[PDB]
Design a protein around this ligand. Sequence first.
Ligand SMILES: [Cu+]
Ligand SMILES: [Cu+]
Ligand SMILES: [Zn+2]
Ligand SMILES: [Zn+2]
Lengths: 152, 152
Amino acid sequence: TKAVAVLKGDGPVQGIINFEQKESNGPVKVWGSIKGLTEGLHGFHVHEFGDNTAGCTSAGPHFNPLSRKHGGPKDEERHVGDLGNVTADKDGVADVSIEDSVISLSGDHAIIGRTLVVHEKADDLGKGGNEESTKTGNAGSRLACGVIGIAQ
Amino acid sequence: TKAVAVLKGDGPVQGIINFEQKESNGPVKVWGSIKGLTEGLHGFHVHEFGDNTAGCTSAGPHFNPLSRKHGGPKDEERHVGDLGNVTADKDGVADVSIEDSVISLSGDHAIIGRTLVVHEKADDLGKGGNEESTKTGNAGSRLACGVIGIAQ
Ligand SMILES: [Cu+]
Ligand SMILES: [Cu+]
Ligand SMILES: [Zn+2]
Ligand SMILES: [Zn+2]
């Protein structure tokens, strides 16, 4: 019903993101803060593995159990892990307060034990007009990540 | 089913611990290495929460879903999270190789999304002769921890 991810990297990006799901067939509330970001949009995705053995690279690809194309969170055609973009202000702080009905904290699409990643660049939401757009949204390198763990 | 925990803290203690469970009702193999430790025994436990918001303290208590008293891994009376001690050599390296049939990587009591912790002192296995012994094993402070994540 409740989880948390503490985001850390090799640079200045750090944050804490909370997840809450009241019902198993209900939406997941996702909220928290990330700091140390460049002003503007940054890709925000759940990746497949909760493996930090080689930094954020070890988390592997976007969590995509249904083998779909990359999209935005509002799209029917999207990865389970496609949570779009977070927005950082001029002081580099991104306040996050979204709701999603595709991710879950239980069942086959459970994101517990997987990795939340915030990216270098904006997610183009599959609308970038190149092959990479429908794979990763061209969001670039992984600035910070954290395993999604069970919280009180 | 496979998992991994990358142990980090505020000091020299770091390690990678792998988990593998070939069958959902079979033993979990736990192996890896921890370095930066003092020579001797160090408490080695799964804690309830995969929460690193305030360091290793945020992981909360020993994972104990069946509400049992603290013990050693061989004891019938023990917490699910009671994996005993790891032994560090004169170089400060603990090679970990154990099998456990109480913990699981799947089901309602799965340890995926929870926290693996290595401790300052030896776990006394509930035989230290005081109140704290039968609660936590008197293993002292938490030197390093990591959320247990899904691995490839
Ligand atoms: Cu991502
Ligand atoms: Cu512990
Ligand atoms: Zn995606
Ligand atoms: Zn215990």
